[PDB]
Amino acid sequence: IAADHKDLIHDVSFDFHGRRMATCSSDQSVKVWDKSENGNWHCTASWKTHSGSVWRVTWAHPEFGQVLASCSFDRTAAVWEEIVGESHWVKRTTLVDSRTSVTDVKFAPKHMGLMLATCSADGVVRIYEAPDVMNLSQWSLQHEISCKLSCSCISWNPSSSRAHSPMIAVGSDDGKVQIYEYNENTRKYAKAETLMSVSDPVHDIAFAPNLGRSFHILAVATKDVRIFTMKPLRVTKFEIHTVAQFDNHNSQVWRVSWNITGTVLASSGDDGTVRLWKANYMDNWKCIGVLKG
Amino acid sequence: FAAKFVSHKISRTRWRPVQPDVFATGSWDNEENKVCVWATSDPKQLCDIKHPGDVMDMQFLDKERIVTGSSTGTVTIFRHHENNQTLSVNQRWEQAAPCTAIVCSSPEIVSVGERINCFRAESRDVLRTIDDADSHGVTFLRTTEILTVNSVGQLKLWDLRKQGNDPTQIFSVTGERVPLHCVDRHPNQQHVVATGGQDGMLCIWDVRHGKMPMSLLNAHEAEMWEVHFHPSNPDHLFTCSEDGSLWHWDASAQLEITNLLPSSTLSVNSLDVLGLVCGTDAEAIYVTRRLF
Amino acid sequence: DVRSPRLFPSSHAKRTSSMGLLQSKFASPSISRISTAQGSHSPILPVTPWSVPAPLAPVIP
């Protein structure tokens, strides 16, 4: 069913269950879809979130509640809570702090708490926390760090904490890759390492779920697909390897996405082809198959 | 014990009003929720009910009629015209939140939630509504008394006969450990009652003889599932557990409880046995039709 | 170092004053403490504030 967006759709996101979908567009509206038990996606609600185009959206962990965060060229991020009784979603808060148009917003892993990051044309990554879970309006600004200027994407490590430490990859412009970690009790983000050999503009980056694997994997959709393997070992405690590169798109790779398990990677591009990837026994990636449109 | 793969995780089973030969069944958890009447005994899918809405309540509303309660706390009933193989959907109510069990007091199909909406015999208007929030035990101790048992396993005799919205009495364990899954009320006398402990215990009850916890146990493994009892031998009964398990506690025998059923499968659907199932806490697919 | 900060964090020089430098006595710099009423009012001044922040980063007084 047609998204019902007048202007172009920037982002689509699934909830935790995978039953709900959120969309955002340049028409300034966010639509939420319900996958009915009868299998047709029907939109639950659509509302005018922002004054300017809405680039990005994300869903928080379902333990906190039904929360969607949005990101706009109006320089704001908004948090919304679903009201069962309904106008369906209410603004919890606004983040005015970004002095420029924001490219992306992502919730952190559930173990961390309500935490989110955002990156903007100001090139300042900001992290906001809700220090009280009860007060969904109480969003404090946890941290601010400087990057460079142009493109942007964010992607947290989804690794459950207790097992692993928090870290986040930021991909702006490029072939240049920037990576950041969290310090012990400095409570500040440090630049552990960088992803090298980035090619063209990094349209997208995602960290893969590290379920049952010691090492971590991040894939970038530049105008080439790359996969990087991070391993901490033990001052410094980081290493990267580059697992694979893939140009069979022959063009811009706009989206890179991972499976829930991290088993499958997907890539899409200007060929209009979507490729699914599996890891070999050798840890090389292979294309399982290609969808077209 | 002739098993049969429905290839459909069963949620309901009735030895129908018409021995335990006319089987009917309601299959929840499918993309268009399912139920079949006259199935199977032999294919006999005369009324494999194409149906939106799932099965919360379920009753053979006649030998040619079928009552049921639908997934959102909706209501659903047709008249099983087994001659011409079609039917007519009798009852369709919207918002009676699902219902948690099913009781009867003929022919006001009383029930409980996990609020009470007393529909009745041709009472297409919701007549009585003692809208008391419940924090799954439901029966007719005497017409039209009942006892709501909240998920603290917290029984409380109320009514719909006289006016009022409180309960009249309350049955309770010392610790309220388990939740409202499976209680018992004897056909030997409608003032005799028990329950099954979700640890694998009994919880036998005395109405007149005080209100004490008469008989616990420690026999089964999982949550209290449901009990096959003979529909005429009140005493004959056998026990179960929430993997779908079944320990034959020969209670017309004296503790004679063994590894009873064709075991080790997933869960069982819902109980009616006369001359059959004793459905578990998780309602998967299983069958055997040799109940004598 | 959180425990050390707490030991440092517990002591207070005087009320009422924004003694981050009290923390500096601690020797631990916190961005939160650094977080600009004049900057907020400004909403050239911003550039000057940025220059001041850079100089501070490059002294504490």
UniProtKB/TrEMBL annotation, chain B:
It is found in: Nucleus. PROSITE patterns: WD_REPEATS_1, WD_REPEATS_2. The keyword Nucleus applies. Keywords: Nucleus, Repeat, WD repeat. The keyword Nucleus applies. WD repeats lie at residues 173-215, 217-253. PANTHER family: NUCLEOPORIN NUP43. It comes from the Eukaryota. SUPFAM superfamilies: WD40 repeat-like. This is MGC154553 protein. GO terms for cellular component: cytosol; nuclear pore outer ring. It holds the Pfam family WD40.
